[PDB]
A and B are shown apart, each in its own frame.
Chain A
């Protein structure tokens, strides 16, 4: 599981440099699902930072929107995982200088964040970025 994902990180990264969203989203969904069931510590963090990184580098916001709304709608999520996701989106939304992308992304970060989490200070950073906007 952590072995599958850690020998997959080279494989899934060399697969990601092709874009090809559907299949990788499906496999990452399956592995994240099993790790949510099994309550694993580091593989969940690696896999979710992996999917978020892949969406952000591959330059789709609907796909990361789907990732956010799935594992918000999906259950048994580690709170630190959601926190790392939203804080990564924060550090993936403050450096971008695209106005429509930035506004849509802060809209998503607003509607995902019911149930504020210890990282809500880092989310306060992004809401002050929204304050600038």
Chain B
């Protein structure tokens, strides 16, 4: 029955890869949560921030990063795995730009990095980088895309996705919002993300506890929403 949960390369009875699920549970171990919402021409990423003390530099503890000048990234899990995976993603995107002469589409970036994680989970020489990824960007003739990658190398596009400790409830809230079939304008997308986080956390957070990134068609650059604009957005949400 059990005892096959020791090696990444060992198939259990019923063909169940325990250690991969162990890594998926390790994703949650970071204790944080993150959600991504996409509109007609925008894609908003928001994540929670926990600070044990004022003693840390808040400018360096950002949980969302930028893969290329128009491709942004957010992720959760173990932070060391997080930074290693963003380093690998940036390396792969730069290699793609070098070899093929044009910017990496979000779907292809997710596909290649998921292939890397698959090769990690296929051979027993690697711990399969137990951190989940969400990538955002804009592509011509297809519009904005939001893609998610996991340590198993399973990648998929999302109209809206979530991660962290509150994965299931955040996904249920996302489904409840998307079943209403509304256009989700940029401010509306951002507010849906903030409301999802606040309700699934039941905290009604101060604006200093969230980092937000957004990519739009008119602003293809991955803009990290600064304190001024996140304050505007979420205190407007408060009054709205």
Contacts and interface: CB of A to CB of B under 8 A. Distances in A.
Whether A and B touch directly in their complex, counting CB atoms under 8 A apart, is answered as yes
Interface of A: 33, 37, 76
Nearest first, the 5 closest Cβ-Cβ pairs linking A and B are A33-B239, A37-B238, A76-B204, A37-B204, A33-B238
Contacts of A33: 238-239
Interface residues of B, number: 3
Contacts of A37: 204, 238
Interface of B: 204, 238-239
Contacts of B204: 37, 76
A37 B152 CA distance: 42
A37 B204 CA distance: 8
The majority secondary structure among interface residues of chain A is: helix
Nearest to A75: B195
A37 B239 CA distance: 9
Nearest to B237: A75
Nearest to B199: A75
Nearest to B239: A33
A37 B198 CA distance: 13
Nearest to A29: B239
B4 to A, nearest CB: 49
Nearest to B235: A37
Contacts of B239: 33
Nearest to B238: A37
Nearest to A37: B238
A33 B238 CA distance: 8
Contacts of B238: 33, 37
A76 B195 CA distance: 12
A131 B239 CA distance: 39
B177 to A, nearest CB: 14
B239 to A, nearest CB: 6
B88 to A, nearest CB: 42
A37 B236 CA distance: 12
B144 to A, nearest CB: 28
Nearest to A30: B239
5 contacts: A33-B238, A33-B239, A37-B204, A37-B238, A76-B204
Contacts of A76: 204
